[PDB]
């Protein structure tokens, strides 16, 4: 096997030109699509805002049309999913991870229009879901679509173009090239066996979708938080403590998200009409809360800059947290199309901010700025629930651009993964694949 | 299928003892890296102090510059040729082998050989990095604690070997991410599944970085300040720069490999012809580290200067050619020390050059050569050693210019794509292949 290694080493990093070229066309499409989806969601949130202006008087009539708009659009989304593609409910990342393990089908002719138009409805209604879910899955299917449409043969081409699709999916979702590529090679890939994923092609895919994203979304960052202060060495231990707190909370949240899937499954019992209507009830509650306390609803991207700057009070933070936990669950655990990735950044910031405030007054000799703890806490729920720290840390870094906080960010994150391990919690994306993969064997 | 459900529910569960031991590994790797760093500094300093004591008599100084660097070079080649030939050159090839179980990790030998050997070659002002020394020493450190605590199992053997190499690169460039990313893009067994625990690699890198910051706070290794932005209609220029790195990446590999061979004849495997030839090269370094310091040394000094566009076109072209020469002679002669660093240096100097031509050609783009300098910095690492994701993240971590991320990726990927289609090979695999093939031949 040594002579085999000398044979292999001399032949490393040689991807077939056709796989590379097709990775490029995958990215391009994934990007344009993500960009389109992004704009669709925006347009709808905007129309909905335009209705509340047409009924800006009559207070109850406003609260009504806020509900009904988000109700109808949510219902429309749940339906498009329940009716034509049940695999494209919830996130979509569980499924694409399965698809890489050959354990799941990539029914693109179905999912693409279902996730797209479905997400358009759930997200555009102002529900507490991300864009990653939609774009990552849509991304994978797009990579599947071009695999089929061009009839590319082999394991390499099937895993790679499925992976790069997912990568360009996350990348065009957060303007985060690195986080995309890192996500694949830390989470997306078959975690227990060797695979035929070409990293170089994943890149080209991510590149293309980022370029497509920058073409249409130049000169406005997703999160602008400005350059925060530094973190002195004798401060570091406070980030460990913060991580520990995220560590014990990470799995606790996974119980809630899993259990709430079950608790909400009874309200409809797998019935299309009970579901669609239940969905429109949650959806409407979001467009309602996106008026009476917008911090509780929506994707979450709005409250991040505000929280980091320390413009929220301790009360308001605690309230934002509690109510977001609620609305994050109700939206995701009810299997509506949309990622959990984003509202998890929101919850992490809000917690980090809170811990930072307490830190600030307790240690005035440290000259703390809560916002550093807000940025350390940002990717921490990602490292404690999803258990992908290297993705979460690089995701944060790419969006907040505070590299001087690299150490506190790593330390918090690693503390969250180490304590999410020792409190018996599971990678929330595996856990749902295992529930889905087990529930398919458990009907035989 | 049912095996997968069993595995998924059991993912990311590293034995606490592997975690705990990864933490100690880092700590040691770091303190050692820090120590080595300081040693090299101390010696570069003493050698500066000698040139002061003979600051008059011109040929007398040129001589004492040679002799200091000669002697300390010879001392290094000897400590390697005599007690651990595996710790010559980089050391990264060996540790990669070590993870493939195709090479032994003789820490009782290499630790003090690489350490004090590097101290000699580096401290003499030779064109070698600190990565080589620290990465290898790092792995061996992880081996040492594996042995000394008798930790059993593949996981423990590969993990503590990897995190050692990771905490090795990490405290080498103050670059935590580049460390972890290097393991999972290059260092790992590239063709089969392995038992490396990422979570534990982290803890290791963390600890070595904390060790590095405790002794090296408040001074960055490269300070280039915040450069300008890169407009979208500029991007194609970084593709072209990448392509140019792509064609040169393999050509450089030929010369590094071929120059190992051409230098092997001057000694023929003979300890005395070797150690004296080594002192001849070493002495040429301390000499050039006086008559044109930009041609000699680790290279870290010319980067900030190059990026700001303080070098002329002539001076750049000369620093390039002369550095190609001195980089080869020092690494290809199997002296202990990484090639990682002088590869960044080469990349910056080329990038800057490309940027200057760019600036005058397209005044409507409002270019700043220094953006192309930072795009070119990790590019040689993506074309010679074919680890772009590590090279990009390494540069980003050292330069802090995240707004140049696209140019950086585009150049890098252009370098990897064109180093593939001009038949070049990952220079760290190519050396492992040479060493592993020369073992059965």
């Amino acid at each position, epitope marked *: 096997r040594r002579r085999q290694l000398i044979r292999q080493l001399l032949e490393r990093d040689k991807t077939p030109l056709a796989i590379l070229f097709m990775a490029a066309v995958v990215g391009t499409l994934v990007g344009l699509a993500a960009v389109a989806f992004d704009k669709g969601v925006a347009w709808l949130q905007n129309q909905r805002m335009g209705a509340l202006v047409h009924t800006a008087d009559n207070y109850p009539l406003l609260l009504t049309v806020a509900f009904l708009c988000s109700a109808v659009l949510a219902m429309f989304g749940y339906f498009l999913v329940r009716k034509y593609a049940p695999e494209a409910g919830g996130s979509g990342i569980p499924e694409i991870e399965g698809a890489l393990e050959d354990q799941r089908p990539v029914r693109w002719w179905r999912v693409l229009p279902v996730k797209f138009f479905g997400g358009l409805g759930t997200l555009g209604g102002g529900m507490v879901l991300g864009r990653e879910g939609p774009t990552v899955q849509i991304g994978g299917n797009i990579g599947r679509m071009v695999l089929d449409i061009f009839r590319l043969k082999g394991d390499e081409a099937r895993h790679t173009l499925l992976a790069t699709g997912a990568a360009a999916g996350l990348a065009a979702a957060f303007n985060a090239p690195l986080a995309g590529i890192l996500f694949i090679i830390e989470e997306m890939r078959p975690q227990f066996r060797y695979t035929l994923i070409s990293i170089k092609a994943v890149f080209i895919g991510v590149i293309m979708s980022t370029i497509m994203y920058r073409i249409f979304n130049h000169e406005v960052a997703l999160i602008d938080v400005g350059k925060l202060s530094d973190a002195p060495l004798n401060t570091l231990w406070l980030y460990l403590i913060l991580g520990i707190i995220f560590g014990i909370f990470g799995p606790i949240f996974n119980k809630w998200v899993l259990g709430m899937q079950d608790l909400l499954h009874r309200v409809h019992g797998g019935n299309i009409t009970k579901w669609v209507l239940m969905g429109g009830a949650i959806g409407g509650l979001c467009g309602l809360l996106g008026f009476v306390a917008p911090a509780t609803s929506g994707g979450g991207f709005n409250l991040i800059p505000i929280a980091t700057a320390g413009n929220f009070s301790m009360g308001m933070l605690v309230f934002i947290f509690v109510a977001r936990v609620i609305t994050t669950l109700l939206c995701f655990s009810s299997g509506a199309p949309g990622g959990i990735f984003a509202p998890m950044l929101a919850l992490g910031t809000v917690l980090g901010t809170a811990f930072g405030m307490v830190a600030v007054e307790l240690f005035p000799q440290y000259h703390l700025e809560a916002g550093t703890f807000a940025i350390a806490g940002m990717g921490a729920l990602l490292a404690a629930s999803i258990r992908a720290p290297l993705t979460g840390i690089i995701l944060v870094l790419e969006m907040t651009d505070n590299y001087q906080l690299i150490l506190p960010m790593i330390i918090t994150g690693l503390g969250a993964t180490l304590l999410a391990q020792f409190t018996g919690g599971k990678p929330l994306f595996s856990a749902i694949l295992a529930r889905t993969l087990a529930k398919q064997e458990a009907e035989q | 299928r049912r095996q997968l459900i069993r595995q998924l529910l059991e993912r990311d569960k590293t034995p606490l003892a592997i975690l705990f031991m990864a933490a100690v590994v880092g700590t040691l790797v770091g303190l050692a890296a820090v120590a080595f760093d300081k040693g090299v500094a101390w010696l570069q300093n003493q050698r500066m102090g000698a040139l002061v004591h003979t600051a008059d008599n011109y040929p007398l100084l040129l001589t004492v510059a040679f002799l200091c660097s000669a002697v300390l070079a010879m001392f290094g080649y000897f400590l390697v040729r005599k007690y651990a030939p595996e710790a010559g050159g980089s050391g990264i090839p060996e540790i990669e082998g070590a993870l493939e179980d195709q090479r032994p990790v003789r820490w009782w030998r290499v630790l003090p050989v690489k350490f004090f050997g590097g101290l000699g070659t580096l401290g003499g002002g030779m064109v070698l990095g600190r990565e080589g020394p620290t990465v290898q020493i790092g792995g061996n450190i992880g081996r040492m604690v594996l042995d000394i605590f008798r930790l059993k199992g593949d996981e423990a053997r590969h993990t503590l070997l990897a995190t050692g190499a990771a905490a090795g690169l990490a405290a080498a460039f103050n670059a935590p991410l580049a460390g972890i990313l290097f393991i999972i893009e290059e260092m790992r067994p590239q063709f089969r599944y392995t038992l490396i625990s990422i979570k534990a690699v982290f803890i290791g890198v963390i600890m070595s970085t904390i060790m590095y910051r405790i002794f090296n706070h408040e001074v960055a290794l490269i300070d280039v300040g915040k450069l300008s932005d890169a407009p979208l209609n500029t991007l194609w220029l970084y593709l072209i720069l990448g392509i140019i790195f792509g064609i040169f990446g393999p050509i450089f590999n030929k010369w590094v490999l071929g120059m190992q061979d051409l230098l092997h004849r001057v000694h023929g495997g003979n300890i005395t012809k070797w150690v004296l030839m080594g002192g001849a090269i070493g002495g040429l370094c301390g000499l050039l580290g006086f008559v044109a310091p930009a041609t000699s040394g680790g290279g870290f000094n010319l980067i900030p200067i190059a990026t700001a566009g303080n070098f002329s076109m002539g001076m750049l072209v000369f620093i390039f050619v002369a550095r190609v020469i001195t980089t080869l002679l020092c690494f290809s002669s199997g002296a202990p020390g990484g090639i990682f660093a002088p590869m960044l240096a080469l990349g910056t100097v080329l990038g800057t050059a490309f940027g200057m031509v760019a600036v005058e050609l397209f*005044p409507q783009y409002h270019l700043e050569a220094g953006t192309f300098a930072i795009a070119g910095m990790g590019a040689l690492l993506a074309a010679s050693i074919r680890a772009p994701l590590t090279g990009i993240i390494l540069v980003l971590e050292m330069t802090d210019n995240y707004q140049l991320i696209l140019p950086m990726i585009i150049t890098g990927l252009g370098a990897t794509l064109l180093a593939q289609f001009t038949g070049g090979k990952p220079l760290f695999s190519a050396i492992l292949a040479r060493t592993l093939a020369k073992q059965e031949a």
Partner: antibody
């Protein structure tokens, strides 16, 4: 964001004057500045431009030291020295902050302009 | 340097009219710009990269074209639109402005 250029007024033909532009509301580094002028009742003409670290400074088809564009970043201020002043330099001088969309640059926020009259 | 010459030197139209002025160039220019200079005021970056509107420009304004010919259209003109408009390129150094189309209102 305000560009408030001053220093204009009366000059005697052949002499020289230093215009200043004082900026406030944006990081005065990071931006390329420019000078555009407007002779009375006529269109717009590009005088020159200057990057942040004063390392590149292009002028328009002028002469030797006809125009000279400096900038004291420590004062958030842009300067323009016009020497050997003939009466084509009787104009309104806008200091303007420069920026790009896709990449082909434009003149972003414009100042009020100062008036320069060249007469005896 | 590129010479841009602008269609009507001066034009008159009653509000509610659809109005297009033209910017023609000596060579090939791409992603040009437009400035609005209302009377006794400094110009305002009005349209940029051939088609994008600056932030706070009514959606009644549009812009298009490529190569030699460019336009700016006010679809249903308003009387508050009375200015002189300048086109400017910097696709080729040095940047060069247009001659100015001057919109007059017929009331």
């Amino acid at each position: 964001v305000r560009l408030l250029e001053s220093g204009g007024g009366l000059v005697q033909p052949g002499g020289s004057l230093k215009l200043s532009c004082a900026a406030s509301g944006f990081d005065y580094s990071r931006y390329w500045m420019s000078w555009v002028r407007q002779a009375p009742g006529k269109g717009l003409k590009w005088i020159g431009e200057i990057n942040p670290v004063s390392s590149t400074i292009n002028y328009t088809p002028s002469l030797k030291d006809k125009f000279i564009i400096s900038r004291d970043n420590a004062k958030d201020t842009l300067y323009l020295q016009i020497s050997k002043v003939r009466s084509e330099d009787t104009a309104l001088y806008y200091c303007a902050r420069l920026y790009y969309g896709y990449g082909y640059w434009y003149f972003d926020v414009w100042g009020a302009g100062t008036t320069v009259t060249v007469s005896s | 340097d590129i010479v841009l010459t602008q269609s009507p030197a001066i034009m008159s139209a009653a509000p509610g009219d659809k109005v297009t002025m033209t910017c023609s160039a000596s060579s090939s220019v791409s992603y040009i710009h437009w400035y609005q200079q209302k009377s006794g005021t400094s110009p305002k970056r009005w349209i940029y990269d051939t088609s994008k509107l600056t932030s706070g420009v009514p959606v009644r304004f549009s812009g298009s074209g490529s190569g030699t010919s460019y336009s700016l259209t006010i679809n249903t003109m308003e009387a508050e639109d009375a200015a002189t408009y300048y086109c400017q390129q910097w696709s080729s150094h040095p940047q060069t402005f247009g001659g100015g189309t001057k919109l007059e209102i017929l009331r």
